[PDB]
Structure 1
Amino acid sequence: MGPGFDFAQAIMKKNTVIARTEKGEFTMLGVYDRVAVIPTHASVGEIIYINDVETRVLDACALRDLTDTNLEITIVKLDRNQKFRDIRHFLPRCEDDYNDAVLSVHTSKFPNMYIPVGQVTNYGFLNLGGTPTHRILMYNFPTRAGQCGGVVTTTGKVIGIHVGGNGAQGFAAMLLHSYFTD
């Protein structure tokens, strides 16, 4: 509808895949080469389904901060025959608050879904499903089962992936440029 949705659509159309694990179907953001991200609660194993293709996982790392606190981001390298468009220059360098964000989802359940979530707070600490978690972004939207892995963007920045909610608010794990240095 506007330039917010334009940037979100551009990311969804080239940098997402449908990832299926034993814990369900997730939106999965491809960042560069064969490297993607997914919420750690997806429980990635040795084999994952990517757009319903059986795919070997070459490496998976559940990220934690230097306090050894969960970040709820898993970085996956896929044995895929094709690279992602490199979007690392759209990742923020530092923890921040944002205005006027979009949460975008693409699964079997929720195809081509875009949500204007409004103001994003640097919330910090969240007890997420009983797991102490850091670097949480918060937005005021009643997100649902099926939106985890959803991409949070502003015009020109990919800032997070959706990892939970409490019925009134939604929560995203920050993406930072420093996670994907090679």
Structure 2
Amino acid sequence: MGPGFDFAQAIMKKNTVIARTEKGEFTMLGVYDRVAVIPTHASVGEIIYINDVETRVLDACALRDLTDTNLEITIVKLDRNQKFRDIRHFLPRCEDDYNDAVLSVHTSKFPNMYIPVGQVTNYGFLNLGGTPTHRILMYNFPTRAGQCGGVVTTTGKVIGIHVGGNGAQGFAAMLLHSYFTD
């Protein structure tokens, strides 16, 4: 409807796939080459489905900060015959707060879904499903099951992926440029 949704749409149309694990169907953001991210609670194994095609996982790394605290981001390298558009230049360099964010989801259950979630707070620490977690972003929208892996954007920035909620608020793990240096 406006320039927030335009950026969000441009990211969904070229940089997302539908990932399926034994734990469910997820929105999966492709970042560059054959490298994508997914919530760690997806429990990525040796094999994953990408748009319903059996795909070998060349590497999977559950990120933790330097205090050995969960960040809830898994970086996956896929044995895929095609590269993603490189969007690493849209990733923030530091932890921050944001105005006027959009959460975008694309699954079988929720195709072409966009939610204006408004202000995003640098929440920091969250006990997420009983797991101490750092670098959490919070927005005040009643996010539901099926939205995990959803991409959080502002105009010009891809800032996080949705990893949970409590009925009233939603929570995203931060994406930082330094996760994807090679």
Partner of 2:140: 140
CA offsets 1:77-116 (integer angstroms, 9 cap, x no match): 0000000000000000000000000000000000000000
The separation in 2 between residues aligned to 1:49 and 1:105, in whole angstroms, is 17
How many Å apart are 1:44 and its aligned residue?
0.1
CA offsets 1:12-57 (integer angstroms, 9 cap, x no match): 0000000000000000000000000000000000000000000000
How many Å apart are 1:70 and its aligned residue?
0.1
List runs of 5+ in structure 1 lacking aligned partners. Answer: none
Q: How does 1:53-132 map to 2 (within 5 A)?
A: 53-132=53-132
The separation in 2 between residues aligned to 1:26 and 1:144, in whole angstroms, is 13
The separation in 2 between residues aligned to 1:36 and 1:111, in whole angstroms, is 19
How many Å apart are 1:151 and its aligned residue?
0.1
> Any runs of at least 4 consecutive aligned residues in structure 1 with deviations exceeding 2 A, and if so which?
none
The separation in 2 between residues aligned to 1:25 and 1:81, in whole angstroms, is 21
How many Å apart are 1:173 and its aligned residue?
0.0
Partner of 2:6: 6
- TM-score with structure 2 length normalisation? 1.00
**% identity of equivalent residues:** 100
Partner of 1:161: 161
RMSD (Å) for aligned C-alpha atoms:
0.1
The separation in 1 between residues aligned to 2:133 and 2:7, in whole angstroms, is 28
CA offsets 1:135-160 (integer angstroms, 9 cap, x no match): 00000000000000000000000000
List runs of 5+ in structure 2 lacking aligned partners. Answer: none
How many Å apart are 1:59 and its aligned residue?
0.1
